[PDB]
Structure formats: structure tokens, C-alpha cells
């Protein structure tokens, strides 16, 4: 049901009296390929435990995306920290034209055709947050019609 993807594993370190203590971090995303997506970030002493913590957090933090037949509704911009991303709907057969971190998010969410570009910092943790922030704020003609007090047909 849920597609899981491991985006990045990093080794971090803190210093103590006896020397350095290493640990690992894991960044993952989960999604149902139909408009739901979440990301999790886990820390542990061993890689497998870090990944399992991340998968566990991701499943509890999914948001909803209003997709339009495997693509976006309109161009969107997302921002988080140094990361600025841009995404655009594309025609069928285009595929996912996106960088590695944006690709994992877009794919587990069910986006099949999209043109994307990451500006600024490409740190994966912040690119994922910016991507999901762009998808979560995307509007559909339904909600645009509702808030404006108009029918969908007068919108399109």
C-alpha cells in the first residue's frame, strides 16, 4: 500500500571527554501514490535503527495533495531555510524531471509528470520540507471555486 523511500543517511558526531561519539541520521518519505505523502527523520547509533525510526515518524505525518491525473494543478513555489524549489505540471509521458530529493517525494505522492528545479541550498532535509510545503499549498479548481463563491465551470 505505502511506498517507502530512503533519501539520505548521514553520519554525525558529538565530542565527549573520551573522544568522539558517532551516530547516524536517516531521512525517508512514505506515500500511497495517490496524493498522500509524509517525511520522517530518525537518529540512532546504528543505521538500521535510524531508518526504522524515520519510517515510523513518516507514517504519522502524512499530508494530502490535490493531484490532477498524476500531475500538479498549477506551478508552485516552496521554501524552507535555504531551499527554494519550483514545480510545474507537465504533459503525459514527460516523467519526473527533478533532482534526487524532490524525485523521491514526488514519486511516493503519486506525481507522474512534473518539471521541477531546486534553487539555493540543496540540503536534502530542507529540500524535502520545501517540496512538501509546495505540494501542500497547491490549490484545486474545486477549492478555488468554493472559497470564491463560484461554480467550477465559471472558474475554468
Amino acid at each position: 500500500e505505502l511506498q517507502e523511500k530512503l533519501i539520505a543517511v548521514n553520519r554525525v558526531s558529538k565530542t565527549v571527554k573520551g573522544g568522539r561519539i558517532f551516530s547516524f541520521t536517516a531521512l525517508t518519505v512514505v506515500g500511497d501514490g495517490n496524493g498522500r505523502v509524509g517525511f520522517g527523520y530518525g537518529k540512532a547509533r546504528e543505521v538500521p535503527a535510524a531508518i526504522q525510526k524515520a519510517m515510523e515518524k513518516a507514517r504519522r505525518n502524512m499530508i494530502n495533495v490535490a493531484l490532477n491525473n498524476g500531475t500538479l494543478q498549477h506551478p508552485v513555489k516552496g521554501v524552507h531555510t535555504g531551499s527554494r524549489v519550483f514545480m510545474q505540471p507537465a504533459s503525459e509521458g514527460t516523467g519526473i524531471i527533478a533532482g534526487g530529493a524532490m524525485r523521491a517525494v514526488l514519486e511516493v505522492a503519486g506525481v507522474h509528470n512534473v518539471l521541477a528545479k531546486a534553487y539555493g541550498s540543496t540540503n536534502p532535509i530542507n529540500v524535502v520540507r520545501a517540496t512538501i510545503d509546495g505540494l501542500e499549498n497547491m490549490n484545486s479548481p474545486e477549492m478555488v471555486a468554493a472559497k470564491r463563491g463560484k461554480s467550477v465551470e465559471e472558474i475554468l
Binding site: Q73, P141, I155, L156
Partner: protein
Amino acid sequence: SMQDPIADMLTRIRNGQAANKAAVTMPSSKLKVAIANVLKEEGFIEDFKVEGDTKPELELTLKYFQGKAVVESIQRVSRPGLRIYKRKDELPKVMAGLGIAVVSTSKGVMTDRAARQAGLGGEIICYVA
């Protein structure tokens, strides 16, 4: 000094929506009224009224849907420091057609969809989404 009353109008809307204000008030002008008319017909604001004679005062009643501002973004395009005019075949589309562009044509101020149907270009006043 004040050099763009239209940008001041849009900013008052933008800032009032962020402050959850029920209405915003500002000195009036015929161009401001013409823009208010388009905002109302598209359902972005609720109503407007001009009050006063020698110093008219325009008041815009803002709307909120499910506790959220209806105007998600409002942005000046043409501005005194840089005017923007578009021909009919190059009128912009806001949010893939889900938003509007307020265009000043020789037949008056209207949306980008209305200007396309009349086969006219003009000055791109602002985007509303």
C-alpha cells in the same frame, strides 16, 4: 512620498487579510473603484462602498472561507518605476487560470479572461490568486 496609490490599495488588502480584519478603508479614486469592482465580481472581496463627498473614502469588506483569507496572494505588476503592457495574444495566466490578472484595456478595467474574449491587450495592473 506616496507615489503608487494602487500598490497601497493592494497592500492594505494583503495586510488586512493577514490581520484578520473584517474591512479595510482607504482614500478613494475612480481607478481604485474600478479595481474593487473586478475584485467583487470575481468573489475575492465581499463588497465595497464609497462614502464621502469632498474626500471620498473607499471601504472594502474582506472575506474568509474556512477561517482562511480568500485572497491567497495579491501582487502589483505594472508599477510607476516599470510599466508593463501586454498584447492580446500574450496576456498572462495567473495560477494556470485559477487566479486573475486585472488588466486595463481601452474598454475599461477587466480580468485577463474578459480581455481575451474582447480581443484586447492593455496594462497588467496586478495578479490576484
